[PDB]
Amino acid sequence: QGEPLNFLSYLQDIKLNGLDSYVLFIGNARIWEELYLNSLYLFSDRGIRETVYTAFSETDIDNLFNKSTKLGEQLNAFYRTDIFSLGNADNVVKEMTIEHYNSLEEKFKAGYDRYVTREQEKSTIGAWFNSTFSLDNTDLENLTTIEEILANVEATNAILNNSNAIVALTMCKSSMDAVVASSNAMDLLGQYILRVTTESPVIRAILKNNVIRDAIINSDEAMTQISSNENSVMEIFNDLEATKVLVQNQNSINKILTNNVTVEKIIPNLLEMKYNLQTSLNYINTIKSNIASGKGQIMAITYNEEIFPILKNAVKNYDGMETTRNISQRDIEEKIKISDAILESSIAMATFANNSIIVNKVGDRVGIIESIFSKTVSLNAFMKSTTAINILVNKTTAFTKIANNSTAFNAMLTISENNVTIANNTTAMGIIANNAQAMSTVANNDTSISVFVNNTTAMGIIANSSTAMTKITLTGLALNRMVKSNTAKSILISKNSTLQTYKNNIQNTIQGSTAYFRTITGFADADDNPPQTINSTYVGITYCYGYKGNSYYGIVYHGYNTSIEAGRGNGYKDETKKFITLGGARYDQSGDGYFTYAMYQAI
Amino acid sequence: QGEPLNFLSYLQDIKLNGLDSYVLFIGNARIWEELYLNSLYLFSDRGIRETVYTAFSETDIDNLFNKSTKLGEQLNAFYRTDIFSLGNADNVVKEMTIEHYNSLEEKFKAGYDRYVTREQEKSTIGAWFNSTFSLDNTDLENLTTIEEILANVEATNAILNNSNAIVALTMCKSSMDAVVASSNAMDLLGQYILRVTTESPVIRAILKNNVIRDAIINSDEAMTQISSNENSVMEIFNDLEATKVLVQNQNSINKILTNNVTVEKIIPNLLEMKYNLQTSLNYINTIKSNIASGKGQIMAITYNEEIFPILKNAVKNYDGMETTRNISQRDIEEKIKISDAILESSIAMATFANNSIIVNKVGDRVGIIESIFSKTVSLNAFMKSTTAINILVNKTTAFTKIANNSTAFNAMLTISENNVTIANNTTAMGIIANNAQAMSTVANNDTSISVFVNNTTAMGIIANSSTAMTKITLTGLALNRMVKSNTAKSILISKNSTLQTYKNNIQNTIQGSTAYFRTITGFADADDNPPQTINSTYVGITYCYGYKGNSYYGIVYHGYNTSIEAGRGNGYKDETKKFITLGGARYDQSGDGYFTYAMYQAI
Ligand SMILES: [Mg+2]
Ligand SMILES: [Mg+2]
Ligand SMILES: [Mg+2]
Ligand SMILES: [Mg+2]
């Protein structure tokens, strides 16, 4: 037999009774201790593991650390590993690393902390560090508090450059509390990171350690060091939780943005990434169905309700492909989360929205603006930044994507100054004016259409776009605002034929939309010239023809410029001899003409 | 008698905890071994059997075979039987048969294999054989390799005349390889080994030597043995070159067809396989493009002209998928080759074409007939087998597929007896007559149409098919043969309206195809009744109308039965009052009628 029989009976009763076992009653602690100090089976019996971990009191963990002559073997059995050194707690602490420490559960982490505190409080902290890890530093020897150690750079680095001593230093709650409090220690810690940045396991283990991670990312000093090395920052964005901590600290964001490589290459790649990753994930999920089908072809050939033996490998291969594929999927789904952690941070997005290098990258790189559109926070941050729009209005591809995304377009138009920025850009206005959806949004947005029709550039382009005109001439609001604009009246009167193209749309919209137009003069016949009226809010509709259908002409000119003819006509009254006038009207005759005329006003 | 208490506690913990028991943790292997080497209760406790079998590592089974002094008792308890001899592994091996070996589960079969390999590959192979199976041979005692044994005739004969020693020999890959390698290999296989075992290892080792393979596959004796074991035959079709040798020997094909499992299950699967494999290969090649695209998405995110480090794994994963996929592809491409080796063998195909079980499988199983169509040899073998066609004419789906495949249809019609078989089958004739493509092939095939139009069944169906008729009435050859047929003339004159439906087709085909029709009498007008002519190869075309367009009737009757009216007409000459007569014509009038008539003859 390996262990005594009563130990086996104790394990049986623990399995059968959980925490209700007589073994785990406080009154029987004496035997319970004897078990966990001497049994290996207790720590290798997974079927009771959940109970055992719960049963361990703080005193029990202290007893383990202080008394067990095989704490290493018991930890190795308890975590199904071999990473811990054999023997008592001193052998375990001597070979402990941050990675191996992170493999521990909470109770054993706390046990490590308390044990190291006890051992330091026996002798002195400096002498304990020096002798335990053989740091061979006499300066450290005579230091009696953690503050005295942090005042000495030589001793601090002697500790930090030891994989085990750093675990002792960082994972002792009080000691760590001093390190966070010291402005100098943080700096040294930051420098430590820079040295390890190319030892991938070490840096990854550091970033998976919540205490060190959180202290480093939120430290002004440490980040200052780390930001200088783009490859260190790279490792932070390779870890989801570290990224989540980072994108919630304004100061650390600014710090990493002090590095030109980070700004130019790392951040745009992190933004561009989600689009490429989602596309790759679509291909992965297509491969899943293709694997299922190709395997189903093989499965259909049966032999005693089993696979046809000659094809057995063909099945196994298809399963292998399904394994690796699944792996791929997981990995990709992880990286997307990282992107989502960045895109969902208003702190990180707003800042990026006011950085001109990053916004130029958004404009230049296919995929970044798609990723930005994939989240509300990132979308609003960029669409509502007048700086970002001021840059992006010159990026035709990105701005076309904005104009086609109704949500991003509407978000962009919530800022008036963005409307002004757009109006003064010939390219952008050219895109919008020839986009039926966008022009539909603009025509029903008072601010946007009011800015556009009163801007010489935008209104110049709109007048040359049959799409935009159409929409505007069918919308009461837009037609009202356009009629009131002197810029629009001037441009349209210089392009009279374009104006008259939409005479029916204009008549119908004016007469229909009483919310935006009122009648000044109902239709009336006139043998002699009616008195001219000039008012920059007026719209006239005038039938010109001859008296009793003779061959003499009625002529109508715009009110906003009474020298520009809007139209003329002889013969009989007719829908083709009916003309729109802007800003009023002036009436004239060549011979005995005749008019049937009405006047309206934009409210 | 009785087992120690800790063993009972171990069994109890195994029951309570399954694989989570401390007993089954690798770190406690020492006690686990001590259990399974010394306990029978472990092997007779059915309540934990599934766990125990799962817990056994390869090393554990090796330890059992090497060290247990009661392997026989433990095997008997574990399989609730008495077939294994008592004592250690040597006693068990001494009485082992193929029957008892096959009753073992995979782990213990593998254990037997590894144990006998270890014992034979030592320098005590001769002594082990000698003592284990009680061969009373002192020469064998001192032989140290299998080659030294095969050089000695006495020792070989001592071993081979023991069936169990042969089992031990055959389950050891290297030893078997020597037997295949030995100069008198054939003899040894013929006289001793094959009689006792045709199992998979034997056939596998035989197939690695081209000479021994070819001799075995072409041996009437050996095949007779091998054919009785369907799983041995399975191993031959799992090897391309062995299949290529097999499908070139008529006698060996017949031998393997003496096994009903081979005929009913193995051969149809080998035939059905190519279709499923080609479909799976299409899916594989789609996966190739999907992997390329999904990887290209990741490759586009660069950093100093290298992959963005955060995505490095995403690249490797995509390469891994490309590795496994490629493996899959090769394997599938191999199996197709095997199918092609079978389909391209006229010997193997012809034989299968005259096996009613296999032909019924061809008719019943989707995929087999496509595979057969995929190769010229296999297609011609089945389409030209009158037995196969005699079965397939009753398989509606398969025969429709034949009728739609122009190549298979044309191949089938090269055999006259196949035409006879089809003509007398209502189903088949129903499919062909309503298939415009097939009827096109038939109408231009002298033999097929000649058989069809002279058969009361086929000709009965053709007369009711507007498709078939159409084709026939537009083809000189077919119309000639149909006109000459007395069966067809009888059926068609009994269906006079159906005949007259195609009067224009018939007129055009007769006048156009001078190769198949000649004019006896050019069109001529007639006031009085022309003299009747009767000839079973004649076709008449007769316009019937009134004299000078009056309301009196001309009437025309068929020559083959001068009492059956073909048509009548009054008024003026007209294309609707024109009638076909078969076998000659008889003319009559109701009042002063009038005719314009011509007579033709099928050459
Ligand atoms: Mg007048
Ligand atoms: Mg006048
Ligand atoms: Mg007459
Ligand atoms: Mg007459």
JSON list of C-alpha atoms in Angstrom, two decimals, chain A residues 378-543:
[
{"chain": "A", "resi": 378, "resn": "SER", "atom": "CA", "xyz": [-16.53, 54.45, -33.08]},
{"chain": "A", "resi": 379, "resn": "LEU", "atom": "CA", "xyz": [-19.04, 55.60, -35.71]},
{"chain": "A", "resi": 380, "resn": "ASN", "atom": "CA", "xyz": [-20.28, 58.58, -33.69]},
{"chain": "A", "resi": 381, "resn": "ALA", "atom": "CA", "xyz": [-16.75, 59.51, -32.60]},
{"chain": "A", "resi": 382, "resn": "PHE", "atom": "CA", "xyz": [-15.56, 59.97, -36.19]},
{"chain": "A", "resi": 383, "resn": "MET", "atom": "CA", "xyz": [-18.78, 61.18, -37.85]},
{"chain": "A", "resi": 384, "resn": "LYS", "atom": "CA", "xyz": [-19.30, 63.93, -35.26]},
{"chain": "A", "resi": 385, "resn": "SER", "atom": "CA", "xyz": [-15.65, 65.09, -35.18]},
{"chain": "A", "resi": 386, "resn": "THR", "atom": "CA", "xyz": [-15.43, 68.22, -37.33]},
{"chain": "A", "resi": 387, "resn": "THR", "atom": "CA", "xyz": [-11.68, 67.60, -37.55]},
{"chain": "A", "resi": 388, "resn": "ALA", "atom": "CA", "xyz": [-12.20, 64.05, -38.84]},
{"chain": "A", "resi": 389, "resn": "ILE", "atom": "CA", "xyz": [-14.83, 65.16, -41.37]},
{"chain": "A", "resi": 390, "resn": "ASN", "atom": "CA", "xyz": [-12.62, 68.08, -42.42]},
{"chain": "A", "resi": 391, "resn": "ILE", "atom": "CA", "xyz": [-9.99, 65.51, -43.36]},
{"chain": "A", "resi": 392, "resn": "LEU", "atom": "CA", "xyz": [-12.29, 62.78, -44.73]},
{"chain": "A", "resi": 393, "resn": "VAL", "atom": "CA", "xyz": [-14.25, 65.05, -47.10]},
{"chain": "A", "resi": 394, "resn": "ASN", "atom": "CA", "xyz": [-11.17, 64.85, -49.37]},
{"chain": "A", "resi": 395, "resn": "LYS", "atom": "CA", "xyz": [-11.07, 61.01, -49.31]},
{"chain": "A", "resi": 396, "resn": "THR", "atom": "CA", "xyz": [-13.44, 60.08, -52.13]},
{"chain": "A", "resi": 397, "resn": "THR", "atom": "CA", "xyz": [-13.62, 56.34, -51.43]},
{"chain": "A", "resi": 398, "resn": "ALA", "atom": "CA", "xyz": [-14.13, 56.75, -47.68]},
{"chain": "A", "resi": 399, "resn": "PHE", "atom": "CA", "xyz": [-16.64, 59.56, -48.20]},
{"chain": "A", "resi": 400, "resn": "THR", "atom": "CA", "xyz": [-18.56, 57.52, -50.77]},
{"chain": "A", "resi": 401, "resn": "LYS", "atom": "CA", "xyz": [-18.78, 54.75, -48.18]},
{"chain": "A", "resi": 402, "resn": "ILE", "atom": "CA", "xyz": [-20.05, 57.34, -45.69]},
{"chain": "A", "resi": 403, "resn": "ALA", "atom": "CA", "xyz": [-22.67, 58.56, -48.17]},
{"chain": "A", "resi": 404, "resn": "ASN", "atom": "CA", "xyz": [-23.86, 54.99, -48.81]},
{"chain": "A", "resi": 405, "resn": "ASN", "atom": "CA", "xyz": [-24.09, 54.14, -45.09]},
{"chain": "A", "resi": 406, "resn": "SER", "atom": "CA", "xyz": [-27.33, 55.83, -44.01]},
{"chain": "A", "resi": 407, "resn": "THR", "atom": "CA", "xyz": [-26.43, 55.63, -40.31]},
{"chain": "A", "resi": 408, "resn": "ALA", "atom": "CA", "xyz": [-23.00, 57.24, -40.72]},
{"chain": "A", "resi": 409, "resn": "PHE", "atom": "CA", "xyz": [-24.38, 59.89, -43.08]},
{"chain": "A", "resi": 410, "resn": "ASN", "atom": "CA", "xyz": [-27.18, 60.85, -40.68]},
{"chain": "A", "resi": 411, "resn": "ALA", "atom": "CA", "xyz": [-24.72, 60.91, -37.77]},
{"chain": "A", "resi": 412, "resn": "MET", "atom": "CA", "xyz": [-22.43, 63.21, -39.76]},
{"chain": "A", "resi": 413, "resn": "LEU", "atom": "CA", "xyz": [-25.26, 65.60, -40.58]},
{"chain": "A", "resi": 414, "resn": "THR", "atom": "CA", "xyz": [-26.11, 66.10, -36.88]},
{"chain": "A", "resi": 415, "resn": "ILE", "atom": "CA", "xyz": [-23.19, 68.59, -36.74]},
{"chain": "A", "resi": 416, "resn": "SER", "atom": "CA", "xyz": [-23.89, 71.84, -38.63]},
{"chain": "A", "resi": 417, "resn": "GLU", "atom": "CA", "xyz": [-20.23, 72.69, -39.23]},
{"chain": "A", "resi": 418, "resn": "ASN", "atom": "CA", "xyz": [-19.95, 69.32, -40.98]},
{"chain": "A", "resi": 419, "resn": "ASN", "atom": "CA", "xyz": [-22.65, 70.51, -43.39]},
{"chain": "A", "resi": 420, "resn": "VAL", "atom": "CA", "xyz": [-20.57, 73.62, -44.05]},
{"chain": "A", "resi": 421, "resn": "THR", "atom": "CA", "xyz": [-17.41, 71.54, -44.57]},
{"chain": "A", "resi": 422, "resn": "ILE", "atom": "CA", "xyz": [-19.21, 69.27, -47.05]},
{"chain": "A", "resi": 423, "resn": "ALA", "atom": "CA", "xyz": [-20.84, 72.13, -48.97]},
{"chain": "A", "resi": 424, "resn": "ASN", "atom": "CA", "xyz": [-17.46, 73.69, -49.83]},
{"chain": "A", "resi": 425, "resn": "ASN", "atom": "CA", "xyz": [-16.00, 70.44, -51.25]},
{"chain": "A", "resi": 426, "resn": "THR", "atom": "CA", "xyz": [-16.72, 69.95, -54.95]},
{"chain": "A", "resi": 427, "resn": "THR", "atom": "CA", "xyz": [-15.96, 66.21, -54.97]},
{"chain": "A", "resi": 428, "resn": "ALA", "atom": "CA", "xyz": [-18.10, 65.32, -51.94]},
{"chain": "A", "resi": 429, "resn": "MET", "atom": "CA", "xyz": [-21.04, 67.39, -53.19]},
{"chain": "A", "resi": 430, "resn": "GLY", "atom": "CA", "xyz": [-20.67, 65.64, -56.53]},
{"chain": "A", "resi": 431, "resn": "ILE", "atom": "CA", "xyz": [-21.01, 62.29, -54.77]},
{"chain": "A", "resi": 432, "resn": "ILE", "atom": "CA", "xyz": [-24.00, 63.33, -52.65]},
{"chain": "A", "resi": 433, "resn": "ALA", "atom": "CA", "xyz": [-25.86, 65.08, -55.48]},
{"chain": "A", "resi": 434, "resn": "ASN", "atom": "CA", "xyz": [-25.75, 61.89, -57.59]},
{"chain": "A", "resi": 435, "resn": "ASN", "atom": "CA", "xyz": [-26.81, 59.59, -54.72]},
{"chain": "A", "resi": 436, "resn": "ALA", "atom": "CA", "xyz": [-30.60, 59.31, -54.56]},
{"chain": "A", "resi": 437, "resn": "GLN", "atom": "CA", "xyz": [-30.57, 58.05, -50.97]},
{"chain": "A", "resi": 438, "resn": "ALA", "atom": "CA", "xyz": [-28.25, 60.75, -49.63]},
{"chain": "A", "resi": 439, "resn": "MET", "atom": "CA", "xyz": [-30.07, 63.53, -51.51]},
{"chain": "A", "resi": 440, "resn": "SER", "atom": "CA", "xyz": [-33.27, 62.18, -49.98]},
{"chain": "A", "resi": 441, "resn": "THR", "atom": "CA", "xyz": [-31.82, 62.55, -46.48]},
{"chain": "A", "resi": 442, "resn": "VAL", "atom": "CA", "xyz": [-30.47, 66.03, -47.27]},
{"chain": "A", "resi": 443, "resn": "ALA", "atom": "CA", "xyz": [-33.72, 67.31, -48.81]},
{"chain": "A", "resi": 444, "resn": "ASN", "atom": "CA", "xyz": [-35.64, 66.40, -45.63]},
{"chain": "A", "resi": 445, "resn": "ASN", "atom": "CA", "xyz": [-32.98, 67.79, -43.25]},
{"chain": "A", "resi": 446, "resn": "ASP", "atom": "CA", "xyz": [-33.63, 71.51, -42.74]},
{"chain": "A", "resi": 447, "resn": "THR", "atom": "CA", "xyz": [-30.08, 72.36, -41.64]},
{"chain": "A", "resi": 448, "resn": "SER", "atom": "CA", "xyz": [-28.30, 70.42, -44.40]},
{"chain": "A", "resi": 449, "resn": "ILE", "atom": "CA", "xyz": [-30.45, 71.64, -47.29]},
{"chain": "A", "resi": 450, "resn": "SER", "atom": "CA", "xyz": [-30.43, 75.21, -45.92]},
{"chain": "A", "resi": 451, "resn": "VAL", "atom": "CA", "xyz": [-26.63, 75.21, -45.83]},
{"chain": "A", "resi": 452, "resn": "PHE", "atom": "CA", "xyz": [-26.36, 73.57, -49.26]},
{"chain": "A", "resi": 453, "resn": "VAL", "atom": "CA", "xyz": [-28.74, 75.83, -51.21]},
{"chain": "A", "resi": 454, "resn": "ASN", "atom": "CA", "xyz": [-27.11, 78.96, -49.74]},
{"chain": "A", "resi": 455, "resn": "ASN", "atom": "CA", "xyz": [-23.56, 77.85, -50.68]},
{"chain": "A", "resi": 456, "resn": "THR", "atom": "CA", "xyz": [-22.27, 78.85, -54.11]},
{"chain": "A", "resi": 457, "resn": "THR", "atom": "CA", "xyz": [-20.29, 75.62, -54.56]},
{"chain": "A", "resi": 458, "resn": "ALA", "atom": "CA", "xyz": [-22.88, 73.06, -53.42]},
{"chain": "A", "resi": 459, "resn": "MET", "atom": "CA", "xyz": [-25.79, 74.90, -55.04]},
{"chain": "A", "resi": 460, "resn": "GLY", "atom": "CA", "xyz": [-23.71, 75.10, -58.20]},
{"chain": "A", "resi": 461, "resn": "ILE", "atom": "CA", "xyz": [-23.35, 71.32, -58.25]},
{"chain": "A", "resi": 462, "resn": "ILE", "atom": "CA", "xyz": [-26.97, 70.65, -57.23]},
{"chain": "A", "resi": 463, "resn": "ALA", "atom": "CA", "xyz": [-28.20, 72.73, -60.17]},
{"chain": "A", "resi": 464, "resn": "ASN", "atom": "CA", "xyz": [-26.24, 70.43, -62.51]},
{"chain": "A", "resi": 465, "resn": "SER", "atom": "CA", "xyz": [-27.53, 67.19, -60.92]},
{"chain": "A", "resi": 466, "resn": "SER", "atom": "CA", "xyz": [-30.86, 65.98, -62.29]},
{"chain": "A", "resi": 467, "resn": "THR", "atom": "CA", "xyz": [-31.16, 63.60, -59.34]},
{"chain": "A", "resi": 468, "resn": "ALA", "atom": "CA", "xyz": [-30.80, 66.27, -56.65]},
{"chain": "A", "resi": 469, "resn": "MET", "atom": "CA", "xyz": [-33.04, 68.76, -58.47]},
{"chain": "A", "resi": 470, "resn": "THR", "atom": "CA", "xyz": [-35.70, 66.07, -58.79]},
{"chain": "A", "resi": 471, "resn": "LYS", "atom": "CA", "xyz": [-35.69, 65.35, -55.06]},
{"chain": "A", "resi": 472, "resn": "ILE", "atom": "CA", "xyz": [-35.60, 69.04, -54.17]},
{"chain": "A", "resi": 473, "resn": "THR", "atom": "CA", "xyz": [-38.39, 69.93, -56.57]},
{"chain": "A", "resi": 474, "resn": "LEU", "atom": "CA", "xyz": [-40.60, 67.24, -54.99]},
{"chain": "A", "resi": 475, "resn": "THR", "atom": "CA", "xyz": [-39.95, 68.21, -51.34]},
{"chain": "A", "resi": 476, "resn": "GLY", "atom": "CA", "xyz": [-41.76, 71.17, -49.80]},
{"chain": "A", "resi": 477, "resn": "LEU", "atom": "CA", "xyz": [-39.03, 71.91, -47.25]},
{"chain": "A", "resi": 478, "resn": "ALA", "atom": "CA", "xyz": [-36.14, 71.77, -49.73]},
{"chain": "A", "resi": 479, "resn": "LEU", "atom": "CA", "xyz": [-37.98, 73.73, -52.44]},
{"chain": "A", "resi": 480, "resn": "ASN", "atom": "CA", "xyz": [-38.91, 76.38, -49.86]},
{"chain": "A", "resi": 481, "resn": "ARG", "atom": "CA", "xyz": [-35.32, 76.76, -48.65]},
{"chain": "A", "resi": 482, "resn": "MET", "atom": "CA", "xyz": [-34.00, 76.81, -52.23]},
{"chain": "A", "resi": 483, "resn": "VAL", "atom": "CA", "xyz": [-36.51, 79.44, -53.33]},
{"chain": "A", "resi": 484, "resn": "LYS", "atom": "CA", "xyz": [-35.55, 81.70, -50.44]},
{"chain": "A", "resi": 485, "resn": "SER", "atom": "CA", "xyz": [-31.84, 81.40, -51.28]},
{"chain": "A", "resi": 486, "resn": "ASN", "atom": "CA", "xyz": [-30.54, 84.27, -53.41]},
{"chain": "A", "resi": 487, "resn": "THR", "atom": "CA", "xyz": [-27.58, 82.07, -54.38]},
{"chain": "A", "resi": 488, "resn": "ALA", "atom": "CA", "xyz": [-29.97, 79.42, -55.70]},
{"chain": "A", "resi": 489, "resn": "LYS", "atom": "CA", "xyz": [-32.18, 81.98, -57.44]},
{"chain": "A", "resi": 490, "resn": "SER", "atom": "CA", "xyz": [-29.16, 83.48, -59.20]},
{"chain": "A", "resi": 491, "resn": "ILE", "atom": "CA", "xyz": [-27.73, 80.12, -60.28]},
{"chain": "A", "resi": 492, "resn": "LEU", "atom": "CA", "xyz": [-31.09, 78.78, -61.49]},
{"chain": "A", "resi": 493, "resn": "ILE", "atom": "CA", "xyz": [-31.98, 81.99, -63.34]},
{"chain": "A", "resi": 494, "resn": "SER", "atom": "CA", "xyz": [-28.65, 81.76, -65.16]},
{"chain": "A", "resi": 495, "resn": "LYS", "atom": "CA", "xyz": [-29.68, 78.18, -66.04]},
{"chain": "A", "resi": 496, "resn": "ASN", "atom": "CA", "xyz": [-33.29, 78.93, -66.98]},
{"chain": "A", "resi": 497, "resn": "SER", "atom": "CA", "xyz": [-33.78, 75.79, -69.11]},
{"chain": "A", "resi": 498, "resn": "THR", "atom": "CA", "xyz": [-32.75, 73.56, -66.20]},
{"chain": "A", "resi": 499, "resn": "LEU", "atom": "CA", "xyz": [-35.25, 75.41, -64.00]},
{"chain": "A", "resi": 500, "resn": "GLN", "atom": "CA", "xyz": [-38.11, 75.06, -66.49]},
{"chain": "A", "resi": 501, "resn": "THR", "atom": "CA", "xyz": [-37.37, 71.33, -66.82]},
{"chain": "A", "resi": 502, "resn": "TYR", "atom": "CA", "xyz": [-38.94, 70.93, -63.35]},
{"chain": "A", "resi": 503, "resn": "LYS", "atom": "CA", "xyz": [-41.89, 73.31, -63.75]},
{"chain": "A", "resi": 504, "resn": "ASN", "atom": "CA", "xyz": [-44.47, 70.58, -63.09]},
{"chain": "A", "resi": 505, "resn": "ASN", "atom": "CA", "xyz": [-42.67, 69.26, -60.00]},
{"chain": "A", "resi": 506, "resn": "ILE", "atom": "CA", "xyz": [-42.44, 72.84, -58.72]},
{"chain": "A", "resi": 507, "resn": "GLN", "atom": "CA", "xyz": [-46.11, 73.64, -59.38]},
{"chain": "A", "resi": 508, "resn": "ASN", "atom": "CA", "xyz": [-47.29, 70.41, -57.73]},
{"chain": "A", "resi": 509, "resn": "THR", "atom": "CA", "xyz": [-45.02, 70.85, -54.70]},
{"chain": "A", "resi": 510, "resn": "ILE", "atom": "CA", "xyz": [-46.04, 74.48, -54.21]},
{"chain": "A", "resi": 511, "resn": "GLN", "atom": "CA", "xyz": [-49.79, 73.88, -54.51]},
{"chain": "A", "resi": 512, "resn": "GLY", "atom": "CA", "xyz": [-49.65, 70.67, -52.45]},
{"chain": "A", "resi": 513, "resn": "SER", "atom": "CA", "xyz": [-47.38, 71.70, -49.57]},
{"chain": "A", "resi": 514, "resn": "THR", "atom": "CA", "xyz": [-49.37, 74.38, -47.77]},
{"chain": "A", "resi": 515, "resn": "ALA", "atom": "CA", "xyz": [-47.07, 73.94, -44.76]},
{"chain": "A", "resi": 516, "resn": "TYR", "atom": "CA", "xyz": [-44.24, 75.57, -46.73]},
{"chain": "A", "resi": 517, "resn": "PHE", "atom": "CA", "xyz": [-45.98, 77.70, -49.39]},
{"chain": "A", "resi": 518, "resn": "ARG", "atom": "CA", "xyz": [-48.86, 80.18, -49.39]},
{"chain": "A", "resi": 519, "resn": "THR", "atom": "CA", "xyz": [-50.75, 81.75, -52.29]},
{"chain": "A", "resi": 520, "resn": "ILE", "atom": "CA", "xyz": [-50.18, 85.46, -52.87]},
{"chain": "A", "resi": 521, "resn": "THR", "atom": "CA", "xyz": [-52.28, 85.64, -56.05]},
{"chain": "A", "resi": 522, "resn": "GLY", "atom": "CA", "xyz": [-54.56, 82.92, -57.35]},
{"chain": "A", "resi": 523, "resn": "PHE", "atom": "CA", "xyz": [-54.56, 82.26, -61.08]},
{"chain": "A", "resi": 524, "resn": "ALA", "atom": "CA", "xyz": [-55.97, 85.20, -63.00]},
{"chain": "A", "resi": 525, "resn": "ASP", "atom": "CA", "xyz": [-56.30, 86.20, -66.64]},
{"chain": "A", "resi": 526, "resn": "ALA", "atom": "CA", "xyz": [-54.78, 89.45, -67.89]},
{"chain": "A", "resi": 527, "resn": "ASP", "atom": "CA", "xyz": [-55.00, 91.26, -71.22]},
{"chain": "A", "resi": 528, "resn": "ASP", "atom": "CA", "xyz": [-52.58, 94.04, -70.23]},
{"chain": "A", "resi": 529, "resn": "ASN", "atom": "CA", "xyz": [-49.29, 93.66, -68.38]},
{"chain": "A", "resi": 530, "resn": "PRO", "atom": "CA", "xyz": [-49.82, 92.93, -64.66]},
{"chain": "A", "resi": 531, "resn": "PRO", "atom": "CA", "xyz": [-47.72, 95.09, -62.33]},
{"chain": "A", "resi": 532, "resn": "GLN", "atom": "CA", "xyz": [-44.30, 93.59, -61.68]},
{"chain": "A", "resi": 533, "resn": "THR", "atom": "CA", "xyz": [-43.57, 92.37, -58.17]},
{"chain": "A", "resi": 534, "resn": "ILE", "atom": "CA", "xyz": [-40.10, 91.81, -56.72]},
{"chain": "A", "resi": 535, "resn": "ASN", "atom": "CA", "xyz": [-39.69, 89.74, -53.55]},
{"chain": "A", "resi": 536, "resn": "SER", "atom": "CA", "xyz": [-36.90, 87.22, -52.94]},
{"chain": "A", "resi": 537, "resn": "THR", "atom": "CA", "xyz": [-39.36, 84.75, -51.34]},
{"chain": "A", "resi": 538, "resn": "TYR", "atom": "CA", "xyz": [-41.83, 84.73, -54.26]},
{"chain": "A", "resi": 539, "resn": "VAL", "atom": "CA", "xyz": [-42.42, 82.06, -56.91]},
{"chain": "A", "resi": 540, "resn": "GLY", "atom": "CA", "xyz": [-44.57, 82.83, -59.94]},
{"chain": "A", "resi": 541, "resn": "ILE", "atom": "CA", "xyz": [-46.32, 80.53, -62.41]},
{"chain": "A", "resi": 542, "resn": "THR", "atom": "CA", "xyz": [-47.28, 82.25, -65.66]},
{"chain": "A", "resi": 543, "resn": "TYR", "atom": "CA", "xyz": [-49.09, 81.03, -68.77]}
]
